[PDB]
Structures are given as C-alpha cells and as structure tokens.
C-alpha cells in the first residue's frame, strides 16, 4: 500500500523565493513596489556611509545598493544567513540614519517596511541572538524617538496648532514609532512561536528595563495616549503573559521580572480598561485617558491588523516621487486624508470590541497564570472586573441593546466571558479575599450576581411569535449580515439536509432572545448560583436574602 | 423509525430531568446515578454501517450527545483516574463522529460550537500545564509522508485528517474556547496565527509533494480556509481577514489547475466554486492580491476550446476590470456590455439554482439599503397614506405579521422626516448612535411633536391607540408599536398618553414574560424630557407621585430603577431634593433596596450627603465607609455638625 515518490517537482528554492518576494513587494494600501520605493532613495547629509563591503556613494542609488547587496549576498548565504546578514547591515544603517543632526529619516520607515517583510518572511529556526540584536537595537531606536509617545495630555491654551501643517514628518515618525513597536510585536511573537527550548537565552533584565522605558513612554498617564502604541505596548505585556503561560517552570522568567514592573504594567492596564467605548466620537477628541480615539493622524492597518479604512495606504505611495532617487519624502496634506457611511465606524465598534476582548482576555490569562498568589495579587482584580461587569450590565440594558447595530452581540459575549472570569474566581481564588475588599464593595458584586439572579426566571420562549417579533424590531442589521452570509459566503448556507432548518429557527430564536438583555444561559445562571446560593461568605443568609427572593417571586 | 418511541421518551423525560429545580447545570460530580452506562451507550449505539446513510436521524443521535454532555458538564473532565479526563477519551470517539462530519461541514460547525464543557476542557488542562503528545505524533506521521511511504487508507483517512485539522486551526473564535494556549490573544490576531502559518508552509510543501471527487473536495477546502473565515462586521461589503492566506490559496488553486485533474463530470462543483471565488474577489481592493497569484491565461481557453462554460464569467469580469469606455449600454438585460466580435453568456450561464444566484448577484454589482431592505423583503407620501389604508385593511381581519409589519418602519421614517429639517439613508445618528455622557442630555426637548404634525402618530392613534389590542390582545405586537413610539417620541415631545405609560409600567412590572420589565423604564425619559407643555414643571413630579405611590417589591427593580433614572436625569436642585429622597431610600430601609440604591449611586457616578449626615446625627457607617474608603475624614465636615448639634440636643443628656 506504498505510495510512490514525487521528487519531479520544479522546486522553487527557498532563498530564491525570499529574494523575488522582497524584490517586488507592494504593501497593503500604497501604489508602488517596495524595492523600488527603495530605488528612489539617496542618503545625502551623510556624504559617505559604509559598514561591511557595503559602500554607498554620496548621490548613489540607495535602492540599487540594496539590490546589489541582496544579489551578491545571494550566492553567498543560505536563507537564515541572508536574514541575519541583512538584519545586521540594515541595523547599522538605521542606527546611524538615526544618530545624525541634519539627517532626514525618510528611508528609515520604508526600510522598516523592509524590517517587517523580511523578519516575518520565515521565522522557523531563526535564532534569538539575531532577533534580540534587531530587537534591542530598535527599542533603543525608540528611545532615540522617545520624544513622541509622551507628548502632553492636551493642547494647552498657549500651545498652538498653527503648523507647517505637514503630515509628513508626523506620519514619518508615526510610521517609525508604530512600525517599530510593530517590530517589537512581530519579532517578539516570532520568539513566542519559536521552539520552547530557545527562550530564557534571550530574556534578561535588559528586556525588562528597555521595554520598561518604552512602556512608561507609551501608555501615558500624564500625556496623550496614542491608540496604536497603546495596542502594541499592551500586547507586549501580553507577550510576557505568553511566556508565563508557556514556560512549564515560568517561575524562571517571573523571578526575572520585577514586582515594581508588574505593578507599573497592571496598574496602567487598569488605566486603560476603565476608559470607555463611545462610537459617538471615536473619531474626534474628547475626555482623555478615557477614549481610545484612533484619529486619522494614525489611522491605517498597522503592519498586521487590517483594522479598516487603512486610509493612509496610497498616501504611502505618495511619499516618494516614484520617479527620482530622493532623500526627503513627498508632501501630503495633513487633512485631505480622511458622513458617507459610518459602517466603517461600526467595523471599528467590532474591533474595539476585540480590544476589550483583549482586556478581559489578558486579565483572564494572568488570572490563570497566578495559581499561587503574588504581590500585585491584591483583589482589586475582583473589584474592577466585577465593576466592569456591573457597568456593562446596567448601561448595557439602558443604552446599547435595541439600537439595531450588531455591536451588541460581541458587547454581550464580552461579559458572557467575564462570567467565566468570575466563576474562575469563585472556584479557585476565594482564599485571599480581604474583608477590606468585600465590604468596600458589597455593592457591585451582589449587583453582578443578582443581574443573572433576576434573569433566572427562565420563563420566556413558549413559542416563536414574540421572539421573532423582537427580532424584527432590533435584529435588522444582524440580519443584514445574516442574509449577506447565507446568500453570499458559505458552503453550509445551501442545501440544509432537513435536520437543520429547525436549527435555523431555534438558533435564531435563542440568538434573538439572547439579544434582548434577557434569559442568558442555563450554564450562566447555575454557575453564578453555585457562587451566591453557596453561602461561602455572608452575602446571603435567608434573613436578608428572602427580600430578594420575593423580589424575584420564589 | 425503529427505536423512535425509545428516543421520544428519552428526550421527553430527560428534558424533564433538567435538574432537581430550575437550577440546571449540576456543576459538580453529582453525589439516580445511572448516567455512566447511558454515557457509554449514547456513542456505543451508533457505530453501525447499516444506519449510516441518512442525515436527520443521525443528527438526532448526535444531538443526544449534545444534551447528555451539555447537561452533565461534569462528564468531560471527570478525572478518568489514570491521569486524564473523559474529553480525552472522547477525542478518539468523536473522531469517528467527525469522520462522518468531515463530509457534513454544517454538522461539523455545529459540533464544534456545541462542544463546564469547552471551558472545563481546558480549565484543569491549563492547570495541569495531551497536546504535547498529539503534536509529537503529528510531526511524526507528517514527516513520514513527503517522501512517500504511507498507507493507502491511513493515507486517505489522514489526508482528510490534515484537511480537517487545517479547518480547525482556521475557524473563527467565538466557537472554540480560549482553553488552549495558542489562541490566547485578541484584536483578532493571537498566537497560533504564525505557528499555524509555519504549519501552512509545511502542508503546502508536503501536499505539493503529494479520486477525481477527492480533488474536487481538495480545492473546495483550498477555497474554504479563506472562504468561511470572515469577520464581516459591515453591510453588504464584508471583510476577509488574512491576505497572506488569500494569495496562498490562489497559488495552490494555480498548481491544481496546472496538474489538471480532479475534473469530475455532472458539475456538482467546478462552476459554482470558481464563480463564487472570483465574485467575492472583484470590487475588493485586493486586485493586486489576484494579479500575481493566479491568471488563468491557459485554461481560460475562450477560443471555443475551454464546467468549461463557467471560468468564462470570471474572464468577463476581468474584461469589466479592463473597463475603458468601449463598453456600451445594457441590451440583453445583461451588464452594460462591451464590443463583442466576445460576450459569452447570461448572468446565469450555469444555474443549478445557486450558481445563478452567486453569479447574477456578483455581475449585478458591475452597476457603476437598510431602509430599502424590508421594503423589498415584502415587495413616500403616497407610500405613507397607502400604508395607512392598507393597514386599516390588515387589522380588519386578524393579521399578525404583515399587520405589525409597519411599526419599525414608522419609527425610522419618523427619524428621516425629522432629518429632512429617503434617497440613500438608514440607521441614524441621534436615533441610533451612543455618545459619552447622558443619552438624555443628548436628546433635544424643544423639537417637534406628534399630534397631527406627525401623520405617523396620526395613523398611530388611528390604528393602535383606541383599539381592543390595548385592552386584552397583541401580547408583544402592542409592545413593538411601543418601541415605535419609543423612537417616535425620542424624536418628538409628546402630550399627556401617559395613561398608556402608567398601566404600562405596572404591566411591565408583573409582565408575565420578563420582556416588558424595564421596557417602560426605557420609555419614561422620553416623557420626562419635555417642553411645550410642562417642560420641567410638575409633570415629572406628577409621574413621581404615581411612582412612589407604587411600593411593591414584587418586580421591585421596575419600581425602583426607573424611579431613580427619572429624578437622576432631571436637572438641578430639583433632582437635588430628589437625591435627598433617594439617599433617604438608601438611609436605613429595606436592606434589599438601600444597598441597591448605593449600587446605582455608584452607577450614576459611573455614567446631599452633608445635609443628611448632619440631619441623622442631630436626630440620633456603611455609606461613608464605602464613599471615602474610611470614615475618619468626617472631621472635615464636622463643622456644621458639632457646633449646631450634638450639644444643644438634650442639654444635659446628649
């Protein structure tokens, strides 16, 4: 039952693939090809530059110098070797392109586009030594641009916005900072996706200190926050969590980390999370430290997350003349970039939903991380998690459901997961809770519990008609997508085999009933019951509980 | 058919056996004790090839598993006391069920979502931190191929296995749990993205190194991994999430066409597949995603040489992409055609009742609304009054759907006619978009009214106010017309009407179905905000007398939360005295309610004290303790207290 050999492929060599792919890449949004963008680059105010058989003349073709180095080192190196060689050369490049008085940095970001395409290309057996070389080099690159993410809390009465009005060097350094943090992202996640063996060899307290510099710079509590860097930094925190949940004895890396730094991270996570979601002006500026407003100043995808309008893409192309070797970027209006259809706003409502998914998701993850307690282990997790539960319960019911916009589905799946969070709390972590905390908020926890304890009527459905009516009232947008999906985009959405038309009807029944704020899962209500109706703390003795029992019926 | 009565009694009596009470999970290992044998048997009565040619009865068989395990969540991780769970020893059992569901993709999706179940599957599993073991075996057989020394039937079975594993790692989240390590992160971009992208490189190379209908299904999945993994989150122009995956599938389709086999006749698939694929692609900016990874220059073969009449429509849409003005006016009812000397077929060249849909829809897009949606689903001023008269007719005789088929329309069109202060327009800003602070500081009082200036309300009283439905009918339709009135009055200061509001709120209390409960409360602020008659005067207090006069804690929160929200939302020293009464309601009274009053005090802080403190002191911890985190600051405000009270009271005693 053998299967014969199949070696007669005309195999494209991995090195050749890498080469051609870089050689003709065009990025998501612009108009022009990577290497040739490069071919429109001259590094002028540094009249000579040279590191390792890598001469460039004064007015020389940067881009051709690239393709030169590329091809020559081609018949030198293998795949990984070609990576690390580029990485070192481009690193020296970027470093000096950085440290220079009159130098403009046009090339830097585009080379950072390199950085991505490159390092992403094949992270299979790449070694952390090279990774960290690039990595540290860019973190301290960032501290060479640490003059960004700590710009003040607001425009002062004197601070003007009269301007050269350039979006140029703004977008320049924005791409720089972002792309750079985005490096941090990508290479650090190639770390996390490397074999577990090659891990602690990279982690020193230098990671803590350098990333501590940048984090403090980033998730400001005394400046403007900046949603993209907010993203990046916090997922690096997530990277810490990742190495925790992955290293079997993660106690190694934990002991590496410092208590003050866990604090200066989780506290700023609190600062992040007790902000709010208001699609009302997600696209303007309002109360700060409270709104993740991704303004056009920095609104595109980011080197991974295809977030939306990506409205900067072609403006990436508009940066070079795409006809002449050049050093300083081509002009763009700071304002032409960016009432037609707020459906983009609602794409983003789904995304910032994925963000608060991240918020609760990392908090869950650290929850499971600390099976044993710690110093930042303090219970304010119980407080604030339950607090968020309360607020997205009450304001949920009074505002967001019924507004015929599919944000509510994920807006509720959020707290449906926070249910698991709290139920994790009930099972595991009830050997620390402070009387201090329980009686600082006897209020909100009982609110949370009774939110489903009043839901546990379990007395709605009884037919199709009323709930399908609810649906026709609210589920308009959700059905727009339901019918786009059933009519456009699915194998399963044709030829129901007669055992799933009922699945259609009752699943839509359950989803609409679960849409209108009421009758959540039997699992939900009983798991919450195992917490309150169990008397493990004196929340609920009968003498002060039957007033709620009667307030439910009972 | 055979054990049909047995299954009927089973499902009926076990649905009866929801729990000892309505409290139904049974979170713990339950202390009957007869579900071990039936646990084994529900899957032990199905492995029989004489009962494996029918969809529905096996679907009921697997829904039996759904019920058994769903309502014994103490089954999966039950500590099979070697070291393991029973989700682990259902892994191999459900693999046979997923071999049946390999073909039935619909059933596979359902099974994945169905199977504390998934939470617990990786709750103590992540605490124990089987996956290391399975990944070792995977790498093993994976590398065992590539060179070609595998079985024939483990070949087949596990080739389907590779495809199904790819489908698993490629599906959306909200089904799978976060239980596994490698799904943790969010923003739609979590960890195994790239460990699975490394797995993708691996599968690409190995299967390039790799029965007609087999290749059919193969390219079906080649589409599928990027075809059924969308985040959508939009209107009719939805979102496909990973471009790398997109172009990778494009190039493997290229390699398949290069081989030129897996061509099977009767066209169950070819046409449909290719059509759907390029349709999806078109408008979407990833033209450049397509450009490289797949031109069909060879098998395009549109010289009458070369199922074979379906890649022609993708060639037609590529000519539409060419686009320069040579194209002309719509004649054959097809697209605005172009100079042909050509034009291949009609919008359904091959029309097995679904290919027609896909193509004709896509090609229709070549043309260079929510409000329109339901209108066409049941295919202005004239529309207004024609609606009025036709609804007179519809409530003439016991309609229940096309009758109520007008309420939401009424509302949203009130929104549009307010806006006119219908062309391309749907859900609207104040009507339907939240903001930072108070929704009800957001609303505008001195806006128009309903009486006749809104013929919407004119028809509203015409057919929905003086009706026997308000008396004793339309359990929920009479509610839907009130969500209409919701948005209506939202856009319109109403008159007092409140006769509906009052008995409506008391209804909302009892409610029977807990749907009406806070619904009235949602209603109230509309009445509360007001102008043009008792804007901010007694009107609210008038409601208040009503409300406070209601005292029952039966459906307590209806009585109480709204009681708050009104006064809450109201303006200054008025609501100040109101919150004085509210902190009275929290003062020392109905521990069920004083506490919750504090809860929603925190709530309003989310979205009086000195006066009361001094008062109660003169008269004679929780509140201040919760407020300031410690009561000792009372020194700060003790000024007007110690001086004016605490001594003159009972000159010698106190």
Residue numbers in the entry:
A (entry chain D): 189 to 526, 532 to 747
B (entry chain F): 2 to 32, 44 to 127, 133 to 146, 149 to 229, 236 to 331, 339 to 373, 375 to 401, 412 to 422, ...
List sentences from the manuscript.
The ataxia-telangiectasia mutated (ATM) and ATM-Rad3-related (ATR) are apical kinases that orchestrate the multifaceted DNA damage response to a variety of insults and regulate genomic stability. The basal kinase activity of ATR plays critical regulatory roles during normal cell-cycle progression and aberrant activation of ATR signaling pathway can drive cells into senescence. In short, our study reveals a novel gating mechanism by which kinase N-lobe toggles between two alternative docking sites and recurrently commits the Mec1/ATR kinase for substrate recruitment, confined catalysis and product release.
Firstly, we determined the cryo-EM structure of Mec1-Ddc2 activated by HU. About 40% of particles have been classified into the published conformational state harboring basal activity. About 30% particles are classified into another conformation with a global resolution of 4.5 angstroms. The overall height has been reduced from 170 Å (HU-Dimer1) to 160 Å (HU-Dimer2). In the HU-Dimer2 state, the N-terminal α-solenoid and FAT domains are rather stable. The conformational changes of HU-Dimer2 are condensed in kinase domain, mainly reflected in PRD, FATC and LBE. PRD moves about 10 angstroms outward and downward (away from the activation loop), LBE moves about 8 angstroms inward, and the activation loop has room to move outward. The subtle conformational changes of TRD3 make space and enables the motion of PRD. Globally, the conformational changes of Mec1-Ddc2 activated by HU treatment, which are confined in the FATKIN (FAT-Kinase domains) region, are not significant. The Mec1 activation induced by HU treatment involves the same mechanistic step as the constitutive active Mec1(F2244L) mutant, with relocation of PRD, FATC, and LBE is coupled to subtle conformational changes in FAT and N-lobe.
